[PDB]
Amino acid sequence: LFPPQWICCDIRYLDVSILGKFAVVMADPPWDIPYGTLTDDEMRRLNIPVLQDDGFLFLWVTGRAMELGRECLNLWGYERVDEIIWVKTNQLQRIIHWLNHGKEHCLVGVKGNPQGFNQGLDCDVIVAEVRSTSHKPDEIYGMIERLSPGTRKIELFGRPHNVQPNWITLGNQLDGIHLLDPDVVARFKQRYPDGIISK
Amino acid sequence: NDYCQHFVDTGHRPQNFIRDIRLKDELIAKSNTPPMYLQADIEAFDIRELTPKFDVILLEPPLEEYYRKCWTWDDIMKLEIDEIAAPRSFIFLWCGSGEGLDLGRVCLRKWGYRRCEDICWIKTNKNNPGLDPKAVFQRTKEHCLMGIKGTVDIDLIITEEPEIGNIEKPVEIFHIIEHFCLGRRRLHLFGRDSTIRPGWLTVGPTLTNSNYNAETYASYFSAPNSYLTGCTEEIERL
Ligand SMILES: Nc1ncnc2c1ncn2[C@@H]1O[C@H](CSCC[C@H](N)C(=O)O)[C@@H](O)[C@H]1O
Ligand SMILES: [Mg+2]
């Protein structure tokens, strides 16, 4: 359902089978390389496989998560088919151990055989201003919307400023639960009648 | 300003809108060995003939994707790079923009390296504003992976996209490598006449001439010069 929806939760414990299937998954995990992290095993165990039948996964990585994220992508059933680079700038379009780092990477995985996506409209470089720590560029939502207009999407480890129309956002710094999709509302009430998400 | 939307609207890549040490380059130039080079068909050549063991290897296999004798990742992964790399040494592997970003990492680990940087060559199209089956986006960059084994610059190179059929990589990769001060035994595999450079041994199938002699090359690094970084003053003799 078109307007933003979200669930404050521990993504390790939420039963994501209640959320249905998504054209696009995006995640910005707190890799174990400001907030708390997930262990490599916790990441591997996330139930990403239930979220999609056919579509794309956008996975932000840095440092050794360039490798761990590739492992997770494959374990979850995806093939890496693209890699977006966000060149980090200040307001005047200047770029902000062995090398200084001017970019962050977002792996693009595919699962199944997506049909009817508008592949090739955008390019794989984002030039966008840095904002607060870990805040990814909003440009990625536009690229994803042009790629797959009007379809349902889910974001993992999002914060409040990440909620967007057509997206369901999951994260432990969101504020409560805001669900509008009647199919999701129904399945959430069955699974969590007392509104509590533990174990 | 959303440069992604702008690219969709106009064909100008977002990187078109990115805006904008000598004494050290001088020491590097002073310590550089003479350029040395060898024509060799690397698929048929025992690379163990390349001695001594190298401090830095730049590996630039001619991928088919560069063209729109090519090497596949099957071919590349079976190179025995670990047999000519020094126990402490570095590798710079041009991986392209497709499956190489995964398979090049497999190669680095196969040869005993761990990746420590991912250097991205971002190509602008300021001069010509306006397609792998699996690709989700237009690919406008290439990756050079840096690996290490054993115990000033940024990880971006921005230049204009070269003319079709030009397979050269930006010479700025040499600047980055040399500024690390990693040692003076530097090997460029799949270099060409056009990439030969002081301080480097270049080995490749298309070279028109050779001057490599293993004993002469080794004599550049015999004592007291065995351990120079390539960024310090020459050691006095006589
Ligand atoms: N176990 C967990 N379950 C859900 N969220 C978690 C979590 N562990 C950490 N997080 C949250 O994951 C987020 C990672 S930072 C995410 C940044 C976001 N993409 C942006 O653009 O701003 C943080 O909010 C952190 O608190
Ligand atoms: Mg299609």
Author numbering:
A (entry chain A): 368 to 400, 405 to 467, 474 to 576
B (entry chain B): 117 to 136, 153 to 200, 209 to 270, 275 to 295, 309 to 395
Please share text taken word for word from the publication where this structure appeared.
The m6A RNA modification is catalyzed in the nucleus by a multiprotein writer complex containing the putative methyltransferases METTL3 and METTL14. The m6A writer complex catalyzes the transfer of a methyl group from the donor substrate S-adenosyl methionine (SAM) to the adenine nucleobases in acceptor RNA substrates. Crucially, our structural and biochemical data imply that METTL3 is the sole catalytic subunit of the complex, while METTL14 plays non-catalytic roles in complex stabilization and substrate RNA recruitment. The structures of the METTL3-METTL14 complex reveal that the two methyltransferase subunits form a compact pseudosymmetric heterodimer with overall dimensions of 80 × 40 × 35 Å.
The truncated METTL3-METTL14 complex was crystallized and its structure solved by a single-wavelength anomalous diffraction approach utilizing the anomalous signal of native sulfur atoms. Experimentally-phased electron density maps revealed the presence of a single molecule of the donor product S-adenosyl homocysteine (SAH), serendipitously co-purified with the complex, in the METTL3 active site. High-resolution native data were subsequently measured from a METTL3-METTL14 crystal grown in the presence of SAH and a short m6A-containing oligonucleotide. However, the RNA oligonucleotide was not evident in electron density maps. The final atomic model, containing a single METTL3-METTL14 dimer in the asymmetric unit, was refined at a resolution of 1.85 Å with an Rfree of 19.0%, working R of 15.7%, and good stereochemistry. Comparisons with the structure of the SAH product-bound complex reveal that the both SAM and SAH molecules adopt very similar conformations except for a slight rotation of the ribose moiety in SAH. Additional ordering of ASL1 is observed in the SAH-bound structure, whereby Tyr406METTL3 caps the SAH product and makes a hydrogen bonding interaction with Ser511METTL3 in ASL2. No additional electron density attributable to SAM or SAH could be observed in the proximity of METTL14 in the two structures. Disulfide bridge formation was observed between Cys338METTL14 and Cys388METTL14.
